Amino acid sequence: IQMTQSPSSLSASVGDRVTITCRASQGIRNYLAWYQQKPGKAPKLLIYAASTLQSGVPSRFSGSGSGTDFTLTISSLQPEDVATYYCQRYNRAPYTFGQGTKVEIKRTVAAPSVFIFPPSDEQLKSGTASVVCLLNNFYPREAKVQWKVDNALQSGNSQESVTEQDSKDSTYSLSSTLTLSKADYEKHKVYACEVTHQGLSSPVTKSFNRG
């Protein structure tokens, strides 16, 4: 008993017709369901009996199939439809799920807003420095953050984190953290994050003074 879906991932534009397939390894008649999971939340039931809609579910989600081959169609992709969709066999044990299909959204390119944060004095007391750079409400995901300390490129000492894709305006957000000890942090004046992004004809650079 396997359930397989394709694609594993897809981008598409608001208005587009999206298609997701699900292949059961053995005839399941119409005991197939479709679930959406938004990031952060618990899964909702969209379609059951291969093609029956759950109540209160918008019509633009449509399901077809019988036997082994099944299909979820979303026929007018809206920004709130960003999630991962799962098929599930339920005719019999095992009640197994497909691998999932992440669906990401449009959209026109948008520039980040860049902010810089020094480490609080309550933290240098603690013994270590954290410097934080924030990129806000951009698209697409791709972004380069180069840290610079006394104009020195910095390498091997940042971690990064991306929020999932906003349901409303289809954007991402990034925080970068530069960590280094009180030793090095006291040794320099200019800390800076160079931000490089498709929505920015030239890179933007935020910076502060003290140390």
């Binding site: 059951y48 599930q88 005719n91 009640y95 609080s120 984190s161 957000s173 953290t177």
Partner: protein
Amino acid sequence: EVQLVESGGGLVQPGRSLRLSCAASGFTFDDYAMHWVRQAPGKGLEWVSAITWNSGHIDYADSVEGRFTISRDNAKNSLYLQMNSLRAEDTAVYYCAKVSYLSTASSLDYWGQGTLVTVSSASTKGPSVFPLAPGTAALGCLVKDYFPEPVTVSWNSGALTSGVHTFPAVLQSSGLYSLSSVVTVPSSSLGTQTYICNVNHKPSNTKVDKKV
């Protein structure tokens, strides 16, 4: 208001056991089959176990078999999962789900918010929380060096929703996690309205209102 509230998750050591509970209300529990599904982090949904309305038939995912024991108390209107001989990749968010119709041959039509289970021989460590201070301005809190997940973060006792971004946690070299939550607010405020990040990390039983 249909409800399924899981509980019982947390840190547990390799080899040990955990009992997950799930309290049911809204519908008539005594009448439905129930399921346990789980999700590792960033990974996909995996079905675990099912049991019929009268405990008459049980099914387990080869993947547990002889380690997990689903059960229920129709009087207490509650569902259980006894998980034993745990291993790092039993680590996951575990959901209970209700079945839509009568029959086990029916879809799952409602799922709890779930409980995180983390399988690890590392001790809990509470976070230290640091302020990140600066048209529009941005501020936030740095929630550093805690274990295990989750922490949650609101601003101004939930009063402040627009402009909040809480970033997924990153595991550090040290073996602990780090978080950062942020907000965007008018540059005009600042010196007028006050901003407070409210961090809560249960596993360590600490709250901090850091006050930026």
